[PDB]
């Protein structure tokens, strides 16, 4: 049972971690409707969160008592002999001379009593379960959907964005060499102005 | 830059951890499917990154040419003196009278080289990319719906296999009570068989 626990609260803190993930008319619906759904599992999750700590705070006050006077017979009339019913059930329905066949019979009535008592806690406890469950399923189902529909988006986002980056540098190298071109056939330009100057002016004596 | 390569790389560390998580005739089928695809995604991925490190290689040592003798039409004249072409292409494309012409003639022909094995880098990287991405992305997106779709269930499970637990310890109660009960009827009866064998022996004087 502990590690059913633990196993279970893992399960719960992960679903509620991955709600955290968060912040025409067709995407309006839509857009509410996610956070919606949030809220919702939110709740069911608190409700059978609820029912479970319920069941097993009973379960360790319960096996004490399954321990002690309800373990046997003897420790039953034992403990009856020590509480004994009110005297409105006692009188109505072991009204018997024999004072001991009255603790037997005052037993079993305890017995009848306590087996009401678990029942009606785990009639309880399949409600509160039945309530939630197909609901809760649904919306894990639909939440899950979403991180792994995000997750995937981001994954595959990352190798384009990355891809999309170098063939900028590829591109820009060649803008650089186009303008280091330009830049070279002007050099060029001035050059033969320069000599064809030079030229004019050396023969000129 | 720097940053998109810590981004890509975590999704691909991260889509490979999901495929680590591993290990009629419809389902025979399916079984190979997935073990396939995560042998189709692991090379997809590895030719991807190679690519995307052959790149990152070319940039660092490109970079240094354009900080250097790509940087200017001055350095560029000034590295072609120091370092000429090939007399072959020198003799056909640059036989010029003028030495300094030459030089603006070889200067040209380097920068038309170099945007050549840019553009062949550049078309290489494009094929690689441009023949796995596909093929990658498919893969990704199947193997996330298999995530999601396990841990999914899982969720759901961990609240059934407690809930169910928590029926069992409630039905337990209930046997036990049971028990105890029949027991109880059973000490009873043996009380009234001690007490009326008493009953007798103590009349008989």
Chains 1, 2 share one sequence.
Do not use: W
Not at 75 to 93: G, R, W
């Amino acid at each position: 049972l502990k590690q059913l626990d633990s196993t279970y609260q893992e399960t719960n803190q992960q679903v509620l971690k991955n709600l955290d993930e968060i912040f025409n008319e067709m995407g309006e619906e839509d857009a509410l409707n996610i956070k919606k759904a949030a809220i919702a599992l939110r709740g069911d999750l608190a409700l059978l969160k609820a029912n479970f700590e319920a069941n097993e705070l009973f379960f360790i006050s319960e096996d004490v008592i399954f321990k002690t006077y309800m373990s046997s017979p003897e420790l039953l009339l034992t403990y009856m002999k020590i509480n004994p019913l009110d005297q409105n059930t006692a009188e109505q329905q072991c009204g018997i001379s024999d004072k001991v066949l009255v603790l037997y019979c005052e037993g079993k009535l305890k017995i009848e009593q306590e087996k009401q008592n678990i029942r009606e806690r785990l009639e309880t406890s399949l409600k509160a379960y039945q309530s939630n469950i197909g609901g809760t399923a649904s919306l894990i189902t639909a939440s899950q959907t979403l991180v792994e529909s995000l997750k995937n988006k981001n994954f595959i986002k990352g190798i384009r964005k990355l891809m999309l980056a170098h063939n900028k540098v590829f591109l820009n190298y060649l803008e650089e060499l186009d303008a280091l071109e330009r830049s070279l056939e002007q050099s060029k330009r001035q050059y033969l102005q320069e000599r064809q100057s030079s030229k004019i002016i050396v023969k000129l004596e």
